[PDB]
Amino acid sequence: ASIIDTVANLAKRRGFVYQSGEIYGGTRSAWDYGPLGVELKENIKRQWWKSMVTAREDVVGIDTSIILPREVWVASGHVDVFHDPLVECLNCHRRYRAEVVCPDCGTKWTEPREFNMMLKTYLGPIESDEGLHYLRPETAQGIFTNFANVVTTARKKPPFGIAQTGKSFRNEITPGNFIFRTREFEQMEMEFFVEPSTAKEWHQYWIDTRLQWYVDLGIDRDNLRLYEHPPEKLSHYAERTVDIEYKYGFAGDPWGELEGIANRTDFDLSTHSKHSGVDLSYYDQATDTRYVPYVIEPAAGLTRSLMAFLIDAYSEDEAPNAKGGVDKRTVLRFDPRLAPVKVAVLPLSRHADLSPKARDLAAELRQHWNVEFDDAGAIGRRYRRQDEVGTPYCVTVDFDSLEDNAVTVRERDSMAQERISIDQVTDYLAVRLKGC
Amino acid sequence: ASIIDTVANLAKRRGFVYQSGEIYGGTRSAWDYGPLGVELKENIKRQWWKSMVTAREDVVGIDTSIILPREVWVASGHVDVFHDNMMLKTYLGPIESDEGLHYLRPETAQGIFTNFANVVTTARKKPPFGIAQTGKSFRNEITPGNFIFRTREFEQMEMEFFVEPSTAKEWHQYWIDTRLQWYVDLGIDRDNLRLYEHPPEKLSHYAERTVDIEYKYGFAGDPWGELEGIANRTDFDLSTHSKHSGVDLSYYDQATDTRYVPYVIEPAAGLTRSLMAFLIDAYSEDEVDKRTVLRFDPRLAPVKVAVLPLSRHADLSPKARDLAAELRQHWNVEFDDAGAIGRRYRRQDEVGTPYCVTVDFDSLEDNAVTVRERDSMAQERISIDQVTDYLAVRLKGC
Ligand SMILES: NCC(=O)NS(=O)(=O)OC[C@H]1O[C@@H](n2cnc3c(N)ncnc32)[C@H](O)[C@@H]1O
Ligand SMILES: NCC(=O)NS(=O)(=O)OC[C@H]1O[C@@H](n2cnc3c(N)ncnc32)[C@H](O)[C@@H]1O
Ligand SMILES: [Cl-]
Numbered sequence: 001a002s003i004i005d006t007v008a009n010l011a012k013r014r015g016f017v018y019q020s021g022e023i024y025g026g027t028r029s030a031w032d033y034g035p036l037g038v039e040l041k042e043n044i045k046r047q048w049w050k051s052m053v054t055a056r057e058d059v060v061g062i063d064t065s066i067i068l069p070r071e072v073w074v075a076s077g078h079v080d081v082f083h084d085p086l087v088e089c090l091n092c093h094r095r096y097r098a099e100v101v102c103p104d105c106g107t108k109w110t111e112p113r114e115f116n117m118m119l120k121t122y123l124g125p126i127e128s129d130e131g132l133h134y135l136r137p138e139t140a141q142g143i144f145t146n147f148a149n150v151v152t153t154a155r156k157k158p159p160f161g162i163a164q165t166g167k168s169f170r171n172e173i174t175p176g177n178f179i180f181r182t183r184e185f186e187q188m189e190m191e192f193f194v195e196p197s198t199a200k201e202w203h204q205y206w207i208d209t210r211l212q213w214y215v216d217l218g219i220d221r222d223n224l225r226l227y228e229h230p231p232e233k234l235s236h237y238a239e240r241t242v243d244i245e246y247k248y249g250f251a252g253d254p255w256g257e258l259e260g261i262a263n264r265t266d267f268d269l270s271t272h273s274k275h276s277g278v279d280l281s282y283y284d285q286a287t288d289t290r291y292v293p294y295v296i297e298p299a300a301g302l303t304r305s306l307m308a309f310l311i312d313a314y315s316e317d318e319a320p321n322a323k324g325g326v327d328k329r330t331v332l333r334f335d336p337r338l339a340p341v342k343v344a345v346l347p348l349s350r351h352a353d354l355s356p357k358a359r360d361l362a363a364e365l366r367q368h369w370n371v372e373f374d375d376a377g378a379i380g381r382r383y384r385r386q387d388e389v390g391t392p393y394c395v396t397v398d399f400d401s402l403e404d405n406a407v408t409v410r411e412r413d414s415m416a417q418e419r420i421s422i423d424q425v426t427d428y429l430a431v432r433l434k435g436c
Numbered sequence: 437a438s439i440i441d442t443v444a445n446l447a448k449r450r451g452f453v454y455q456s457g458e459i460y461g462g463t464r465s466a467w468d469y470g471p472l473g474v475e476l477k478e479n480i481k482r483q484w485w486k487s488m489v490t491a492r493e494d495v496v497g498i499d500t501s502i503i504l505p506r507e508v509w510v511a512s513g514h515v516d517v518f519h520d521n522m523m524l525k526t527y528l529g530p531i532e533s534d535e536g537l538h539y540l541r542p543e544t545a546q547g548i549f550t551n552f553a554n555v556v557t558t559a560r561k562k563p564p565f566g567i568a569q570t571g572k573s574f575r576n577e578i579t580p581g582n583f584i585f586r587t588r589e590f591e592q593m594e595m596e597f598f599v600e601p602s603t604a605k606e607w608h609q610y611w612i613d614t615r616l617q618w619y620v621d622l623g624i625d626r627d628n629l630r631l632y633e634h635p636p637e638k639l640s641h642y643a644e645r646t647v648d649i650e651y652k653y654g655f656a657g658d659p660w661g662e663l664e665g666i667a668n669r670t671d672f673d674l675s676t677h678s679k680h681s682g683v684d685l686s687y688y689d690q691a692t693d694t695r696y697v698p699y700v701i702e703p704a705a706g707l708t709r710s711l712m713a714f715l716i717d718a719y720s721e722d723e724v725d726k727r728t729v730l731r732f733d734p735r736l737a738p739v740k741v742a743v744l745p746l747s748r749h750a751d752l753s754p755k756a757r758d759l760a761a762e763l764r765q766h767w768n769v770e771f772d773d774a775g776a777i778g779r780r781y782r783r784q785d786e787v788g789t790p791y792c793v794t795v796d797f798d799s800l801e802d803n804a805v806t807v808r809e810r811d812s813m814a815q816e817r818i819s820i821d822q823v824t825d826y827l828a829v830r831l832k833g834c
């Protein structure tokens with residue numbers, strides 16, 4: 001039994017993900033994120049925004065509409081170029097994306113039809129070509145069309161970036177393994193505008209910087225690699241593209257795309273200047289020169305990053321048992337900043353004298369962190385339940401706590417325990433959790 | 437010139453909002469949020485999530501797809517009743533036909549209801565308890581509203597609170613009062629908030645009683661508008677999805693050997709509509725010398741601290757940038773060395789920054805800075821190695 005399936009099964013059982021519309025028949029192309037999944041996803045998003053926007057003078061944020069004017073995607077080239085070769089089996093009429101045999105009926109086909117990957121919708125009463133709009137296949141175009149607006153209000157000057165997170169939509173012909181490839185997914189994209197002659201050096205800077213970002217948040221460097229797009233795989237907007245790939249563990253090739261980092265040269269600002277008639281070039285007053293910035297674009301996938309962090313954090317080891325034995329303990333070794341639950345408050349038993357001190361403590365901690373309270377069953381089994389979802393620290397309230405006003409604090413990975421006065425537990429965890 | 441127009445112009449000039457696709461012709465039915473706008477919007481969302489989910493034992497979170505199976509909106513009654521049809525269509529898969537027809541969600545609630553049983557299982561929850569969610573919804577609004585008030589694409593913050601039916605009415609009043617207090621706690625003048633009971637004609641097809649929180653936006657004519665809806669949806673939603681799907685979404689109370697379909701109390705807020713309310717409410721003018729100030733609660737202000745070197749100098753600028761870097765570990769910070777310092781104070785007051793930190797020549801001798809509070813303009817001198825802690829207690833959130 002593989003590790004991807006094991007992790008996917010853990011995620012479903014503990015409510016990281018549910019298949020969207022399960023009760024009506026669900027598919028792998030649409031997932032919901034449950035109580036633990038939504039916190040993990042938001043924590044990843046928050047760390048991306050802190051690294052990209054909050055911590056950097058040279059990067060500012062934006063949030064643009066999923067639905068832009070139709071002309072946007074004409075100018076961008078997506079209307080004409082964002083399609084795949086699509087053929088239909090003359091026997092069953094199932095569709096697939098490229099002699100040859102059918103993977104469902106076994107037979108050896110129609111002429112390849114170009115199928116645009118963008119999702120359509122209609123705005124206004126007339127359901128016609130006039131009101132046709134596309135759901136955005138990328139968040140980048142909302143940034144480019146606001147480049148001049150941001151330069152103005154933010155008083156920014158190249159080299160500088162504009163970062164954004166949001167939903168994107170693609171009419172994927174097939175679903176992926178687990179949450180890897182969905183029709184609706186969240187992206188974290190930053191467009192870094194630079195003076196053209198520096199573009200290549202800035203490209204290497206961001207490849208390295210994004211790579212280090214995953215390592216800093218706990219992914220084993222050995223499970224990350226770089227992949228340079230060959231000229232055929234390059235997107236119509238790119239001159240050079242390097243993907244960060246993670247060892248997901250698929251059957252066959254265990255590697256898959258995690259984040260794409262493209263040199264989009266001056267393509268995007270140029271075509272929007274032409275089609276819109278609005279000048280999106282930059283004027284460098286320090287040299288009395290005008291130029292169209294080149295763009296370096298780190299474009300990450302939030303849900304695909306969640307899958308990578310989840311798989312990388314999965315682990316199994318041997319841990320002291322209730323009896324003097326050892327067990328195959330399941331542990332998600334999340335960075336404390338990503339863990340969906342920061343602290344578990346665990347009264348030794350459901351005894352009525354432990355509950356007052358314990359519930360009061362969980363309330364104090366909920367002021368700062370997402371907290372779980374569990375008084376059900378044996379304590380060691382509740383420790384395993386928290387380790388299984390990656391909780392960094394468990395706080396146990398026992399009967400000695402009523403006499404000395406102190407609790408036990410258990411560290412997830414080492415399982416070491418230390419006794420801490422209650423009036424210092426908040427500070428004790430704050431330094432070890434490194435974020436709220 | 438009205439306050440809405442004045443506020444909207446400030447929002448545009450300082451980059452809180454831009455009209456989406458401005459360069460290709462934009463309308464008020466779609467807006468982008470600029471550097472300051474996205475921070476304010478995220479701060480409101482985060483404060484909503486903290487009050488609803490993180491701080492409450494009895495409420496957990498979820499995030500569900502914008503595009504659900506078509507059957508969801510048949511069962512919910514939106515296909516048949518949601519017209520004045522207001523739902524946006526899209527087509528999934530190669531065959532572009534009714535076979536692949538799906539609807540973009542007009543509300544986020546249905547993603548919660550269809551997962552009710554899933555959440556009870558994995559989260560081990562029992563009524564009374566809630567499930568909260570933030571995300572984009574879509575409606576084919578016939579006309580746009582004033583500024584960002586009514587758009588075809590907007591963010592909602594909805595929580596579905598499942599209760600034993602006999603307690604539903606008491607829980608309805610609890611959440612009306614609780615939600616009202618949430619806006620007050622974050623700085624909105626209570627006098628600009630009121631309650632409105634839907635008459636039977638205005639009731640939605642899923643609701644038995646609905647109370648709206650309204651804000652005095654300042655529109656021409658009737659200055660009040662809907663801010664947040666709070667509905668008693670009884671057992672309508674879980675009942676209809678159990679029927680159409682054949683999956684039992686009722687709750688079995690082991691403690692009483694009774695099975696029932698919970699009633700639902702739903703506080704459903706609009707993220708973008710709250711931003712408009714917070715933005716207007718905070719706008720103010722005072723002193724002569726007149727001054728424009730956004731009196732944001734420090735937790736919502738998009739920029740927490742501005743670092744302001746008195747002048748350009750090889751000894752002041754490094755100390756100032758080093759300080760701005762230390763503060764960027766915790767908060768969104770602006771660094772501004774352009775122009776006279778009083779001009780830079782006004783620039784920050786105009787977007788609601790709670791605190792300005794000035795680095796002057798005395799800072800080189802005593803390693804201390806001046807900290808100016810936005811509203812009072814009072815100044816206090818603080819050692820550099822205590823500025824972070826000094827600001828942390830006054831910002832009340834990071
Ligand atoms: N702006 C430049 C760009 O778009 N670039 S990229 O087209 O390569 O998508 C950027 C990232 O979005 C993620 N991603 C893309 N498509 C999907 C999908 N269908 N499901 C899940 N994640 C996806 C993935 O992580 C990918 O690396
Ligand atoms: N689930 C129950 C429900 O949906 N109820 S409600 O339909 O009333 O929308 C809930 C909230 O979403 C916000 N909202 C609604 N429509 C819009 C719009 N077009 N633009 C901006 N905000 C809007 C607004 O704040 C409203 O109170
Ligand atoms: Cl975090």
Ligand SMILES: [Cl-]
Nearest residue numbers: 581582585655
């Ligand atoms: Cl209006």
Ligand code: NA
Nearest residue numbers: 053054056059
């Ligand atoms: Na920044």
Ligand code: NA
Nearest residue numbers: 489492493495
């Ligand atoms: Na909670």
Ligand SMILES: [Zn+2]
Nearest residue numbers: 089092102105
């Ligand atoms: Zn076939």
